[PDB]
Amino acid sequence: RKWEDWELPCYITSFLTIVILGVGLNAKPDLTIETWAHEKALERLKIEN
Amino acid sequence: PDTIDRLIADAEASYNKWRHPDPYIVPWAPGGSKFTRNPAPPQGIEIVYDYGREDN
Amino acid sequence: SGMGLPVGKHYIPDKPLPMNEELLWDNGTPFPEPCIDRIADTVGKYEALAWLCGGLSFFASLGLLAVWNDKASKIPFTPKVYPYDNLRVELGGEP
Amino acid sequence: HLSKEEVIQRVLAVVKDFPKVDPSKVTPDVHFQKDLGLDSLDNVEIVMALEEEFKLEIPDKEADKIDSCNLAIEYIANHPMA
Amino acid sequence: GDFRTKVWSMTGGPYCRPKHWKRNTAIAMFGVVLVCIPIAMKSAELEQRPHHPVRPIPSQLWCKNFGTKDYE
Amino acid sequence: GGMEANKNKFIEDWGTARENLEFNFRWTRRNLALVGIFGIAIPVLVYKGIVREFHMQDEDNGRPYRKFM
Amino acid sequence: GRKKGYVEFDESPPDDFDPANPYKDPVAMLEMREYIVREKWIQIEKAKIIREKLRWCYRIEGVNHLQKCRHLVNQYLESTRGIGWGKDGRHPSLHAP
Amino acid sequence: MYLLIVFLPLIGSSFAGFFGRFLGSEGSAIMTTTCVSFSSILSLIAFYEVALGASACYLRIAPWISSEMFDASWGFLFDSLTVVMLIVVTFISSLVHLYSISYMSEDPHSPRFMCYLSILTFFMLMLVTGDNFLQLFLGWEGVGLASYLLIHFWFTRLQADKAATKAMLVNRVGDFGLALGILGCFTLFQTVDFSTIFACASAPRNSWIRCNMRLNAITLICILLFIGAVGKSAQIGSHTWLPDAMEGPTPVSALIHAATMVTAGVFMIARCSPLFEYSPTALIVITFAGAMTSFLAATTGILQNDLKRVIAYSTCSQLGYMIFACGISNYSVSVFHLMNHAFFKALLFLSAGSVIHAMSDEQDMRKMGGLASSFPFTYAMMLMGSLSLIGFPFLTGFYSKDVILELAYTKYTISGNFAFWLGSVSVLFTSYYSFRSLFLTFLVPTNSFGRDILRCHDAPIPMAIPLILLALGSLFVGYLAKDMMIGLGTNFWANSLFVLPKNEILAESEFAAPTITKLIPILFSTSGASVAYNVNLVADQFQRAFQTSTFCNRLYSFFNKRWFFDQVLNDFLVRSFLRFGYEVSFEALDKGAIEILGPYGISYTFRRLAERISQLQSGFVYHYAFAMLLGLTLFVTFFCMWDSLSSWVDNRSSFILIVSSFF
Amino acid sequence: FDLSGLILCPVLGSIILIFIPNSRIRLIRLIGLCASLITFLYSLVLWIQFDPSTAKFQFVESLRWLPYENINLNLGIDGLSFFFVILTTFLIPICILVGWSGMRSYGKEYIIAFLICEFLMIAVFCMLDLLLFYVFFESVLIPMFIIIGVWGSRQRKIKAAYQFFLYTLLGSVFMLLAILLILFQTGTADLQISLTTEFSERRQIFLWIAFFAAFAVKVPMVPVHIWLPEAHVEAPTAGSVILAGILSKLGTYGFLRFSIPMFPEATLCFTPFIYTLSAIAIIYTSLTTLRQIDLKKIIAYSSVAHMNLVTIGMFSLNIQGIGGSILLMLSHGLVLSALFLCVGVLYDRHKTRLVRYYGGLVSTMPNFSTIFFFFTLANMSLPGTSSFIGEFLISVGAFQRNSLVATLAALGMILGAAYSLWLYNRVVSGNLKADFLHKFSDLNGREVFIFIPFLVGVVRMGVHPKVFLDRMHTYVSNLVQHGKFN
Lengths: 49, 56, 95, 82, 72, 69, 97, 663, 486
Fold this sequence. Notes:
Chain F is an all-alpha fold. Chain F has helices spanning 9-19, 29-61. By secondary structure, chain H is mainly α. Chains H and I meet through α5, α6 and α26 of H and α13, α15, α17, α18 and α20 of I. Chain B: Mammalian complex I is composed of 45 different subunits.
């Protein structure tokens, strides 16, 4: 079958979206305020106890 | 015929008063338990292929 | 379980529709019924309400009879007392 | 589907099993009022018995329309749930 | 039906009997066996049993998080 | 293809009448009562109840009741 | 570009911030707000740690969980006293010092 | 193993629903059934490990909803109660899958049917093994969705669509109540985890502000959770969906509205026992609602002329029984009765479905007489299940309902007295209607049409294998599990079920209940059986009374038509809400006052004002010179003479006169 | 990888299309789609480099607009605007993909208008200047009005466009008065200074009233929602997608960004007012959605109800409430876009909107039935969906703040499970009406692909909302902590 004009750009951008999202989100450092405050709270609790 | 009509009306009212709350209905009959369960496909229905295309 | 009869031709409107026809839960069948159906067509809505109120009043009267009975006042055994201060520490009391 | 000969035989049995009916003069093409001499209420009783035997429900208008053997056989044979 | 044979549905359609349904079902069995392996390994890794069982149990063969948790 | 619905004149008239209800408003007794009950009274009661909830929270907290519009 | 993936913040209120006139310095205002947010998050995470150890106490101790985890219950309930930002619907018996 | 238990139905359902064109009607059935069977085998192994090994398995995958302290998670709590529910759900699901294989052999959409069955099994397993309230809610409404989908399985059936929408709306009202309860619990405890909530449930005894009312926080949360359990268990408040949910096929009814879904409210009440034990008023409300529901269902099921309707009302009555068994602060008894009811009610539904399938989908008892000879095995199964449901001595129902009645008697309280009265009368009515159904379906001389009698065949092998297993369970499950679940001081439940020391009356009932009060259920059952025999088989006056006595006809209609409760509630509330949607909200406000005072009136007024302004430009040089002269004169008067003008006139008055001139 | 580059990507494609003959429709379509997809990928690359730890605006860029008067152009994101930028940039290529079949009749002006709208949306969401934010806020008025008027189905498009333009213009004009007053008072329109400067309580009340009017024109409240159903009905399917998932979200964004932190005391004073408005709007709009006959009207009123739920969730000034508001904003953008796409597919196949003609589409459109069922579930906020995540977090915040308004909002669950189910059953379940409709076609490859990202996004944001939640906790905490210093 003959592919539509939109099919190639749409499939390339879908594959690029999948790879970019997966690789970037998994390789992004976990620098969230939640984890930072969890580490700080653990240190403070260890100091207090 | 006039008193016949009044008798018919009175009998209809009496029947409407004393009719069964849930009268028996054949399952495939209109209002039954099997009504429109797995109906046969309607006739004169067409499925169109290649509806939306960039070029015709 | 098994194929049934064809539903038949639906109703093609030939007269002006009522201004509330959306309150007619019509299938593709020639036998449509409103989205709100009264299961007991023989009785009126107010008569059904009166009968339901009578039933609920029977429930309330039986509850009032239970209250008037005072079964707790005729209990045949003293309340059970557990050892070690009625399990204060086990239940969570201050030790 | 149920054969037209069996439909005819069962309808004739229903008609013949009637008090005010002479079983000899029952033919697939007789009329209730004319040939074997029944009134309207006997006709609707016979229609109800046919319904009960054949496991089918007829609308009231068509039940009134059924007034003779030939009509009864024709309707029951045309019905697919016989 | 007459027109239902031209309608593609994910779950077969009316009276779906493919010619190779046996082979397809065998392939589906193998696919279930394949997909259940990572789930089983993740189960064995994530299970926590703070209490040692009274009797030896099948989960003691693969799960090791038995009595390794404390509230401190 | 020829997929356009077989438009029914009466169904289309019903749709147009439904979407053109603004011409039929006449400020009758029923319309005035409905507007005054479900357009004014009910929202006012909801607002009063919400303010009452806030003031009950203030009383339980011991704070000074808050100021609202 | 960022150097490494671990957060670096200071555990001290920003200087040149006047509590009497917090709105005099915009930078000081915003940094003080950020520091208050960080401290509240630290308190929230401490309460979460206490809650986790409480739940594992309740799981480890069986029927006799009311006396073995009583200290953890009290610790968690006093730790959740001032966690929230807009939890004014919570009763003061559990949300007010 | 445990994630395999939870997700095996999901894998089979997803594969059969995404590749059902390749598996077919037989391949999809085989796949779903084998997935559910392996899930059940793993559930039995988990039962060994957890309940019989005194262990406990905990799991956690992802935070799901993660906020400052909204501690949702994809956890799995495997306690003894969770495992018991796992066995019930998985075993009933496997038996229903086999029954469906043999039942939908002529239905075109068997693959989709099996996909729906397996996805509902997965949702129910997620509900049962819920670590926290959010996962419990997800399972709740997922099973609600799956039941809605399965009810209108024949989407072409108009009443099936109606019933599915009604059932899911009632379950949505229940979900609204349960979500309010979850919100209150989270506000109180700053957590949704069951472990933390149950650990710190006793400490808070403060008040609470809700809807401008001051209520106890614990009692409020428990009452809202019970309201959530009302919709799913079909209690007196929101039971209208259960009888109407019979429009779905019989395997649907048996699996969903007899064993797994409709017992989710009872399961949740037992689960939250450490939270419900500190709300005596909530327990009182639970007892009252359970007793009322049991009596209402028992009376309603008397005059039903439909097998599925009768068995659905029996299910509702048993659910009310176990609900007020929970309200006597005895959840171990309630879960035992839940399991026993699952067994024998699934048996009844499967047997009735076999009868209906063989009788060309008759479903009406008025045309079902004289089938005892033509249905030996099916009648045997129906008899076993009916005797168990009545509580024939030493069957599976004798070990569950009798103890419930004894506890209700021994609970010396107003609620206990109410529950005891209604439970005894409901036992009487249950015996009556079960024996009436048995007589009408099998022993009354033939009333069916000759068309169905000729072609009637008893249940085939895959419809009989589930029946045999369910009969064995309905024989021996009650006896085997009595010491395990309802025994005296058993540590089997461990910490899954919590009962306060002051609320335990099991030993008190066992060693205090007089022999006559112990034997009341048997006497009431046999009296009801005799009454059923008298009414059905030797009686020639009931029809004449119903046709010539207006009060008798009204009473018959009242008891036949669901106590008129469905009609009254539906008509009044739903019709009022439907009328408000168009008569008030749309026509009177959206297309009325808002639009009249909005774009419509504004457009008309601006059109007429623009026209009037344009009338000023009359094209007359004299008019233009006049306008110039008025402009100059007004400027002179209002600026040069402004001292006297301000001493005399006011700006407000001048502008008001201008506006009044403009009308 | 900068916000200026993100803004400039639609401009280049727009210019290229402007300078291309209309006879090369294939080239026009391909270039427009390529530009939209390139911008989407560029925004994703901006996503993989977003810091969720800091509270400062991340990619601050300064341009000299007016050297005096301090109205310099500031471009920046902080975490709340970011997901809206991604949402607009993702939704734009869907609009081009929709009109792919009959784009010659639409012409290159269709794609040019949508690209200009994308440019304006990115400019609005990436802005740290109050005056320039208002400039682009009211700039979005041109392309949407032109789209609705030119590519409307019937002659009521004129009235719909008139209502939309007049309402939004009135709101924007009052907002402009308030913004100019703030500029004169503070000496600058910079967002940081406007946040760090005080206002008098009377001045706060008046400025908040003006801002509330402006934004309540956009987010449909009780008196000013009647312009939205007509706009969706008369706009094309792509225009409806944009107006549902983009412009209302713009309005609620502007409200949440410039009203809550700028005027704390005014928000506290007016909090019960918006609670009662939102509860009344939710109940009334759900009930009037129940009794509707037009598909576009049904989904438009669902939009009104869910947007009122959003605005009932913001003043629950806590992390749960505000995070749920933002999450349900994104989820409702996706769900509204998907539902309007389904209705547009139905209209394109069969040129009618009344549900009386439709029925029994399972037998002919099973893939469409499955997609419609999933998206009606998402609109219903079934657990395991992004709409459920947002709604439950909003309800948690509302119950922590005010139990009565929380219960009133939770009453929306029963009503939203009613009209969604009843509409789905009407359209999809039942028997075919061969007299009305007798030729049918299931979803083709293009439409199926268009629906793929919506399903994936909804499932990912419902099952695992951790990414979206953690990308905004810092901003939510700072926004709630703005007023206080304790």
